[PDB]
Amino acid sequence: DHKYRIWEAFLVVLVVYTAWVSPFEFGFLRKPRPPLSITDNIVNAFFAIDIIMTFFVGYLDKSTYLIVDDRKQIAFKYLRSWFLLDLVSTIPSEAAMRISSQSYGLFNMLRLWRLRRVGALFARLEKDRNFNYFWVRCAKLVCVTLFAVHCAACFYYLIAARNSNPAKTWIGANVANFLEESLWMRYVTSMYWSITTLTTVGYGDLHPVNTKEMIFDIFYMLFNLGLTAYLIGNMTNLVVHGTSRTRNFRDTIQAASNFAHRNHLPPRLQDQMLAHLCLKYRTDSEGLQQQETLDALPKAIRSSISHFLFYSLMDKVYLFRGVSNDLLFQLVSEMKAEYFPPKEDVILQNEAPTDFYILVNGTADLVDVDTGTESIVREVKAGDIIGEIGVLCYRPQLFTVRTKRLCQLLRMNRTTFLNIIQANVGDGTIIMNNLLQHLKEMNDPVMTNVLLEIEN
Amino acid sequence: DHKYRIWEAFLVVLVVYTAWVSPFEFGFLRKPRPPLSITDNIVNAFFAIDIIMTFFVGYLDKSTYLIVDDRKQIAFKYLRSWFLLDLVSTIPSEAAMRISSQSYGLFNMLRLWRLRRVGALFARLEKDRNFNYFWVRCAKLVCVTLFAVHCAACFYYLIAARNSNPAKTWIGANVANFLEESLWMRYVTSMYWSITTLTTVGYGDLHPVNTKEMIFDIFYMLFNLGLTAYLIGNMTNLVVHGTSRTRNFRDTIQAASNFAHRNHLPPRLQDQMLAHLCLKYRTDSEGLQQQETLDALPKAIRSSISHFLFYSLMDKVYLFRGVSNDLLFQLVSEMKAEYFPPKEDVILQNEAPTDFYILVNGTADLVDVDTGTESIVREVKAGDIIGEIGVLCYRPQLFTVRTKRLCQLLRMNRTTFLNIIQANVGDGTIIMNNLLQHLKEMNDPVMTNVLLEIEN
Amino acid sequence: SVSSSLLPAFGTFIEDDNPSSKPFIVLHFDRRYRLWELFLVILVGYSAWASLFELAFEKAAEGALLTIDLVVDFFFAVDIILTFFVSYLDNTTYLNVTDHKLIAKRYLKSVAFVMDVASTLPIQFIYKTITGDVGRGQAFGFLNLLRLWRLRRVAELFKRLEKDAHFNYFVIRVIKLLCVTIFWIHLAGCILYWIAYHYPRPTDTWIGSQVEDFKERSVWLGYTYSMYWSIVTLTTVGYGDLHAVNSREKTFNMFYMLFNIGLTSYIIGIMTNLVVHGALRTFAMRSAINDILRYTSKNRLPDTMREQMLAHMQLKFKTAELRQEEVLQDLPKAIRSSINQHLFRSIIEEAYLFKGFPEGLLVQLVSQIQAEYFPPKMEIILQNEIPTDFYVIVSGGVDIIASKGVSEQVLAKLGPGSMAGEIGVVFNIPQPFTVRTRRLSQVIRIGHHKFKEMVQSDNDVDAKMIIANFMTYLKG
Amino acid sequence: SVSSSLLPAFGTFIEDDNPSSKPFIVLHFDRRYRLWELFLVILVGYSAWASLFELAFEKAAEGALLTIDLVVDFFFAVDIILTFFVSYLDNTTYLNVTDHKLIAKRYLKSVAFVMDVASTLPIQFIYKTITGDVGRGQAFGFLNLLRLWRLRRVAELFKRLEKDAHFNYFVIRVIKLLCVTIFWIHLAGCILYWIAYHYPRPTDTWIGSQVEDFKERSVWLGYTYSMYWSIVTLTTVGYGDLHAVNSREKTFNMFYMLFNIGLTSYIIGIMTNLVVHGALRTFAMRSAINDILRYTSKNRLPDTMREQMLAHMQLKFKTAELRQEEVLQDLPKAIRSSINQHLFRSIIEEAYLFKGFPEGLLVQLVSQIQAEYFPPKMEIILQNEIPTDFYVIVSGGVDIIASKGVSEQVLAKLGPGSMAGEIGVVFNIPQPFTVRTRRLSQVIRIGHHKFKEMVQSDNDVDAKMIIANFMTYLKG
Ligand SMILES: [K+]
Ligand SMILES: [K+]
Ligand SMILES: [K+]
């Protein structure tokens, strides 16, 4: 596969070389000359090598099988599709010129049949994901336009040059003697006229004189009337699909402001709303962006998400020392993730505890709201769980937790924890012992058991 | 009101005359002349009479009263709105000629203040429904374009004429003697140039010569770059919002055909479906497909609509002898109208009677499909009920019905009828008596009436 | 029968049907009558060019064109005789009138008859027979504009092709943008040459200042110049090759250039609509792909996990598609009942509860049922909830589960014909199990409030054979 | 406080107690600092003109322009010294750095420092300060293109104006179309004249064949010609006035004409998007209103019914718009809980069913309550259906109807603070009443199973005191 790709990737530049050379030789030359007659042999040899090497590889049909390798079918597939056309357009132009000198011009225009290969690279690249969809239309349009311009210029100069009485043509009336100048000076005027006409800026010089050029111009000026109108639809269809984010953001901000103004919220509660909204809309690069539409998946698939993101961390925790791991398979599967902005309060003092949280990233501070002072006695790092004792004993929360960075927290409802403990009561003694015996800092067991041992 | 509309619409005719005359007199003339110095005084007289008759006026507002008559109250508003500018554009130019000789030009361009009355007519008429929305944009755009063209032409000729040395100008370099020709021959060349430049077809004659005209043309060639791109967006908007119905028709037909082919229905069972589907698009305004546009309303509205439609018709019926107001009301405001294509069956032989029908319009023939014969023994017109004995006796329907015209009928199922009867049985006793009182005939149904009396 | 055959744009085959009427009448939707109007539409393309070409280029009216203008007119003369044997479809009554006396009075009272007889009279041929062989006068020749009445047939044909679904919509609405512009160009060129021909001074015209004697030359030499000028002025390219010199033609040029804004500003408004409206479905599906693929890379999840997510989404679009293929909503009940009886009657009878049931209730049990469609692996009935309805399986499998916070497979697979949730509804108990789908299937819902009174409404009640069948099934 | 202050485009005032770190620093979201950047953006407007004007029209580099070019450069030299006292906002964390040794190291490691130092350096004055009088050499002058690096300031400014909701979107994205075109025109006009100046034969140039001595004349007379040619070649108007004669300028002309299709095809793609996306609401509303009118007029119904029919639908759009004003759905629980505390806590307590209820469970109950919106004269609970929900009346009013025959208002004056559907859900019996709204109102939905489990899970439950309140209410 690696060897194959390089070879065809090499056989697309030569197609561009042919697509430039053949019309120029058709129009501006009549007899072969060394500098432009040598590379033709090389490219013909390369294409002959390509033609002979086509039965050493097999076609692939998806419906018939995973892969197809055969001998007879390749012969029938190659013979009846494009064998004759590809074979005939390989004879050197020197060999067949002896039939007649007039054939040398028309023969070289048959080499444009090799332009189908560009038609393959723009069909195989369309159905892909590693390349954008915007860099696959502009290139096509540019190539089409440039090819049209080049072909029109060459044909018009041919019509001019084949005439007798070198005056009374589109070029003779402008320069007295045009057959006595360099071959690279007659090729700029033709392109000047072609791009002057195609963009509809008619200066006035270099215009048709006799009737044949009038007819050619009449036929050439209708194709552009459609080619130009085809290029504005493809630009509106691009501009519309590119300004969707900003309008959505403005609409959401305006709606939130209208809501807050209508219900007359206090000044210090609108800040949290306008902070979380901004954080969510600038966190679209990762995380809780697809999870708005990732909730439509079945439970079987979604249950496997937590295993590769939280199961390893869930093993080594303050609690859950030794378990059958059957409980964890559900506890991890029934967890939710949230984000918090820096310098935000999550827990206040004595407000009917309902949940306990697990810390994954960032930091947090445990602060006791004393009489007029706020100490920083305890600081917690990622890994620990806050609020366990207050929710397992129906007691009000102990301290207040304030974040100091961009955090990420896990949440569980106490009702579900009670339900799962009730479903499996035998394993609850391990949790109870783990809570009881691990109070290992100063004053801690006694402040926790001021009434626990009484009510144990 | 009515008398005010006619007089108000009169002045909007003179505004066009003023807007045409004033630039022409500013640019192409120098001193007043009899033919055009007569109607001006008449126009000033009309506008002055309008000025004096502006204090006996009343206006409407959401907050203000519909008619406010306190004269002194109006003055403080009127004098502070346009009283200063409405007076300056009424003095005859001949009176003001003695102020200065050169001031005759700049004094004739102050009459364009009366052009505001067209700006208060293209927005007042915007909020109306008896006039189409297609013919409120094109007129405005056309008027804007014509005004721009006229003004540009007049200003360019003024610039050309005011200069000394008649040669070396955009017009003197093309015509040998441009100052010795009729006033209506100099007015065509200027408009020729203006429309040649506005549509971007630059021919090549009549181009600027010196620097002042170069600067004027530089400033005039940028306005059109926006005035032309503001005319394609409107046309695209109009085209995209005007071709919806046909795609709907094609999509619906495609969906119906695909579904019918997918379930492999018998060949004869698609014809009824297709006929019924196309009949709604034929009668797109008669209430078949319009039902959801009517079924989005509360109970009272759609209960009161049936009053104007079926109340009188339901009174003169075979049954329903003398029920005063309540049973008839409830039965009437519970029906469901349906349209049927011609030549289609509605009741078959011995097919589990469920409901009866009341015919409003069209005609149908009662058909008895016996063994090998099809009779036309009975024919029904508007008013009579079909399918009654088969639902009050739990007996299969005797005959079949086939229509001969586009008919509209009414329907009601048996369950609702029985629930209504159970709700009020006292009025119900009349109905069964009506049938027995009306099965007094000398024809064949007496044999089955005997059976009914056996089972009644 | 009637509306089924008028849908196609090229008629239908006819064989021994009831609207044969008199054996000398032809129907107006037959196939032989729809291959005769196309011939006239083709010949219309020649009779709009010739009139304009002969309006201006005098002395071309004598030659082969004189013979062709009669050979063509003969057919349009024959059509008027033919139009008295053609039926028409009435509007108040959708019956098609097929009476000669009724169709003979419909035509003589319409302006189409007088216009058709006016637009087929040879003016030049008859005039030279009685008067001099050559007609002139700088005005005699504007009667050639009568034959521009026959464009209604093309306008009518381009309305019978858009409604059909067998034909494209990008190919038919773009071939209608060539005829209009080509006719416009033709008209403008011919009018300009006619203006130039009839002028006092021959050296003060647009063509007389370049070619000394445009008269006394070939006709086609004068034709090419006046097509070249028109095609250059349209499309907004301008050379100084040919321009206007008089004051009779500056005005015509101004009015020609002012009307061309609204046509080149109208071609774009259609070629934009086509491209915009042809590229939506791919946009939506590619948006879904791009949204999903971004999640599976930054978090470095394995290949199988991404593959299953990508393979699962495809079925959802198919479910939406089958949900968007239902069209029987507001048709009259007499057709919905027939369709339902043809589609669903067989499987309802083979139900363990519905055995030995009265035939009266089954008729209206088959009606007012709406089919459903569900993707695989999705809940339909949960556990410990108020019963609301029950379902009947049609064409797919399903699984039964019963657990509090986990999953435990119980019983076995259920094929078509089975019920679901029947246990809880009869006893008015919260549902004792949980049922989940297995493959793309369709189900039939019934309800509870309806079924409460539906059974009680009937007079044929057995000795609680509902209970007997239920207990027989439950015992196993 | 982190992202809230950065939202406005022109900063905000600073009062006190902010993260100032007062000694020797200024905050980058201040207001006085946000007016020192607009001044430099204005000065960029002048410095992107003289740089190109001095390339082509030589002999203009000596005069007042030389003095202004230094007076302006003084400020851009001061700015580099200023930018060591500014604070920046991090990315991994959302804290703003206010330490000098951290902001100093960030600047020197980027290309902005070196590019600014290179751009702000005068080179024309110094390199002839003592070497010679004036500079030449046909290449010395391409060095003036270094001062085009200052356009990133305008590029950044135009991004902060579209994210604000106090500014339009049809006026900010249309002033962005003048600048690009004017700069493009100026650049092309200067380059062409520069090409014309340095040529061997002066009679074979575009301007040399119209004016014999374009040199030795004023620079403005050579400026007007080259601006006129550029504006003519753009916009696609072409006279034969001035064209190309050489082979050095035919090529530049070709490329200039090829690069213009993509811009004249890009202005339309924006002016056709603004108009289209500004006119949808009116289209939909007009469709509805003219849908009403066509039906009522044809059926000959009086104006009396249509007066109410038209006005009824107006409230439907208001209800839909009020529904679309809800945005808080995925925010963490600690925010929704507090908002519900501020909005819904008082009315829950004052209910007969909920009186004396434990406060520890009210907090759990007063959360996760999502409200609804109903148009006037709608129905929410019908009669005789399975119980699912009961309701709470925040505002508006509802009425209870229970008479199928001759329906009327009896036992129905419910207002803010009452309840509906209580009896059916609490007695496990089908609903015995139907309730209808009166005006636009908002209500609360609770549920059946959740309220059943909530009381059961608790231990200190009010036993039959709920029953006491219920019997007190129900008795009368
Ligand atoms: K043009
Ligand atoms: K042009
Ligand atoms: K020109």
Numbering used by the authors:
A (entry chain B), B (entry chain D): 54 to 509
C (entry chain C), D (entry chain A): 54 to 529
Describing publication, verbatim:
The electrophysiological results show that AtKC1 inhibits the channel activity of WT AKT1, the constitutively-active mutant Asp379Ala, and the phosphor-mimetics. The overall structure of AKT1-AtKC1 is quite similar to WT AKT1, with root-mean-square deviations of 2.78 Å for 1753 aligned Cα atoms. The inner gate of the hetero-channel is also in closed state. Markedly, the C-linkers of AtKC1 resemble the “straight” C-linkers of AKT1 Mol I/I’, while the C-linkers of AKT1 exhibit the canonical “kinked” conformation as Mol II/II’. The “straight” C-linkers of AtKC1 may restrict the movement of adjacent C-linkers of AKT1. This structural observation mechanistically explains how AtKC1 exerted its inhibitory effect on AKT1. Different from WT AKT1, no extra densities that resemble loop1/1’ of AKT1 have been observed near the “straight” C-linker of AtKC1. This indicates the C-linkers of AtKC1 preferentially adopt a “straight” conformation, without the help of loop1/1’-like elements.
The voltage-gated potassium channel AKT1 is responsible for primary K+ uptake in Arabidopsis roots. AKT1 is the first characterized hyperpolarization-activated voltage-dependent K+ channel in Arabidopsis thaliana, which belongs to the Shaker K+ channel family.
